[PDB]
């Protein structure tokens, strides 16, 4: 997005820095090299957040270009991102796939699990190589949330933010949902979106098993 209204805001910068999403891995992929600002003394690559914003806006345009909101499918095989893709599907009307992706979903037309979408959106290429590979049999364009070391074999709209941190993954999914809903006539671009980005964060079972009881003690006291 080249427009002035389609520009990163200070609040967006603050969310990005708080969630990380600029601290890549110690490895660098030669096709991801163009999104890197500099390598720290830690060996951690710094990802250009402006380039990430532009790629995210391009992905949002690609997603909103589809008339049928169910024709875009969001997949996260890893646990850190299943909640994010479910909330993304709930927000945008997309079709979610979480956890184990059964092979042949896009190619074997016999079973009821078969589906043929018009766009693929992937949390991580290494974790979701199987849907990435299967999209190559059915003429399926792909957006994937790639890190500095993510292979880009079947990736078209690679967003260079992160794929490791739970906060980063939740934030990037929430940001993409916010952008597609603002591009459509859903949000007014003026007031902040009412959905907190914590709604998209993956929580570890040792937090699910203690947070609500801590809150229950605080509420009863």
Partner 1 sequence: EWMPVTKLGRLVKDMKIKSLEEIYLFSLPIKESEIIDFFLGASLKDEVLKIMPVQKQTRAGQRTRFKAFVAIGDYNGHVGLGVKCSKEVATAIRGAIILAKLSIVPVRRGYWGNKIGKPHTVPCKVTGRCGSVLVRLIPAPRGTGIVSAPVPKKLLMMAGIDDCYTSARGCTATLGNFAKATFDAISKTYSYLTPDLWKETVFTKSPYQEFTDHLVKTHT
Partner 2 sequence: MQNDAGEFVDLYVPRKCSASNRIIGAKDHASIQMNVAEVDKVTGRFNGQFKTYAICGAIRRMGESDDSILRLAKADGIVSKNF
Partner 3 sequence: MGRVRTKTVKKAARVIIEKYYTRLGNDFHTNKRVCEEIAIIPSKKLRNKIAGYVTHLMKRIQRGPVRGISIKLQEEERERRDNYVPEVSALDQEIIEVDPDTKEMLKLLDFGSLSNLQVTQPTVGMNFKTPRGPV
Burial classification of residue 169, based on how many CB atoms lie within 10 Å of its CB (0-12 exposed, 13-18 middle, 19 or more buried): buried
| Interatomic CA distance for residues 172 and 144, integer angstroms | 11
Tokens standing for residue 88: 């993304």
- Binding segment (CB under 8 A) for partner 2, from list 73-81, 130-138, 167-175, 193-201: 130-138
Contact residue for partner 2 among 75, 94, 140, 172 (CB under 8 A): 140
Enumerate residues 178-217 that contact partner 3 by CB under 8 A: 196-199, 201, 208, 211-212, 215
From first CA to last CA, the distance across the chain in angstroms is 50
Pairing of strands 45-47, 72-76: unpaired
| Interatomic CA distance for residues 13 and 33, integer angstroms | 22
- Binding segment (CB under 7 A) for RNA, from list 21-29, 55-63, 110-118, 170-178: 21-29
Contact residue for partner 1 among 39, 51, 64, 71 (CB under 8 A): 71
CB of 54 to partner 2, least distance (A): 5
Tokens standing for residue 127: 């974790």
Phi, then psi, of 72 in degrees rounded to 5: -100, 130
17 binds, among partner 1, partner 3, RNA, none (CB under 5 to 8 A by kind): partner 3
Enumerate residues 24-63 that contact RNA by CB under 7 A: 27-30, 33, 41, 43
Q: Give the HSE-up count for residue 173: Cα atoms under 13 Å, Cβ half-sphere.
A: 36
Contact residue for partner 2 among 28, 36, 37, 61 (CB under 8 A): 61
Signed CA dihedral, 76, 197, 53, 4: sign only = positive
Tokens standing for residue 208: 């699910």
DSSP string, 201-218: ----HHHHTTHHHHHHHH
Binding mask 172-201 for partner 2 (x = CB under 8 A): ----------xxxx---x------------
15 binds, among RNA, partner 1, partner 3, none (CB under 5 to 8 A by kind): partner 3
Binding mask 103-142 for partner 3 (x = CB under 8 A): ----------------------------------------
The distance of Cα 21 from the centroid of its chain, to the nearest Å, equals 11
29 binds, among RNA, partner 3, partner 1, none (CB under 5 to 8 A by kind): RNA
Contact residue for partner 3 among 32, 59, 60, 86 (CB under 8 A): 86
């Amino acid at each position: 997005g080249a427009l002035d209204v389609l520009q990163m805001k200070e609040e967006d910068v603050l969310k990005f820095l708080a969630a990380g999403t600029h601290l890549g891995g110690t490895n660098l992929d030669f096709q991801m090299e163009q999104y890197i600002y500099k390598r720290k003394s830690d060996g951690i690559y710094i990802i250009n957040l402006k380039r990430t914003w532009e790629k995210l806006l391009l992905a949002a345009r690609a997603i909103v270009a589809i008339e049928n909101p169910a024709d875009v499918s969001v997949i996260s095989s890893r646990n850190t991102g299943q909640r994010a893709v479910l909330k993304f599907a709930a927000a945008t009307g997309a079709t979610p796939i979480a956890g184990r992706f059964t092979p042949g979903t896009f190619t074997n037309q016999i079973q009821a699990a078969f589906r043929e979408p018009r766009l693929l959106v992937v949390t991580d290429p290494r974790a979701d190589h199987q849907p990435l590979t299967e999209a190559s049999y059915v003429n399926l364009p792909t957006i994937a949330l790639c890190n500095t070391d993510s292979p880009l074999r079947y990736v078209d709209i690679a967003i260079p933010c992160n794929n490791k941190g739970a906060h980063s993954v939740g934030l990037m999914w929430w940001m993409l949902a916010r952008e597609v809903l603002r591009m459509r006539g859903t949000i007014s671009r003026e007031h902040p979106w009412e959905v907190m980005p914590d709604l998209y964060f993956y929580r570890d079972p040792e937090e699910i098993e203690k947070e609500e009881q801590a809150a229950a003690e605080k509420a009863v006291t």
